[PDB]
Write a protein that binds this ligand. Structure first.
Ligand SMILES: [Zn+2]
Ligand SMILES: [Zn+2]
Lengths: 183, 5
């Protein structure tokens, strides 16, 4: 049979894994960046070697559409793929923030990830269905991309989309869109 | 102005 375990400590590494935490898993293949899974259940086998029940986060590439324009570098999709893996497969814990708490980060580390979509793998479906769009390029926000906010419309714009490159945009003390100064 | 990162 199997006992269910409250906590796992990885490799005496001062790191404690509990259900609900997000962790990284070594791929067998050398090239790949580590997989990112949410631990849902920890349990010890009959012979007392530990195993974990996993929900997978999908990278945009694994996903239906592939990486898109607005998909950030650390975009993940919570899947509905489940699995079970040896807990020796775990390397370190990582964090997968909500979109908003990601945007709030003082600065991003390899540790840090974010998710704004649940992705059904068999149907290829995405929840939610609607995205919010910005600028007059009218694209969804990509956190990697720098955006500036007019003080009139208080809409957000890409510097290039309004005809300035990034480092003058950094210089702007005050910004008003051209559409505010017209007609 | 206010920027987003
Ligand atoms: Zn734009
Ligand atoms: Zn404006």
């Amino acid at each position: 049979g199997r006992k269910e375990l409250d906590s796992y400590t990885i490799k005496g590494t001062n790191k404690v894994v509990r259900a609900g935490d997000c962790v990284l898993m070594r791929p067998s293949d050398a090239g790949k960046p580590p997989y990112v899974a949410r631990v849902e259940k920890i349990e010890a086998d009959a012979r007392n070697n530990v195993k974990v029940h996993c929900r997978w986060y999908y990278r945009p590439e694994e996903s239906l559409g592939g990486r898109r324009q607005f998909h950030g570098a650390k975009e993940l999709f919570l899947s509905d793929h489940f699995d079970v893996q040896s807990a020796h497969t775990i390397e370190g814990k990582c964090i997968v923030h909500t979109f908003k708490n990601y945007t709030r980060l003082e600065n991003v580390g390899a540790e840090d990830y974010y998710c704004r979509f649940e992705y059904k793998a068999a149907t290829g479906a995405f929840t939610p269905d609607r995205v919010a769009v910005y600028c007059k390029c009218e694209m969804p926000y990509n956190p990697d991309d720098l955006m500036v906010q007019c003080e009139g419309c208080k809409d957000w714009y890409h510097p290039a989309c309004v005809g300035m490159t990034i480092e003058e945009a950094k210089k702007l003390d005050h910004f008003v869109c051209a559409e505010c100064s017209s007609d | 102005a206010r920027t987003k990162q």
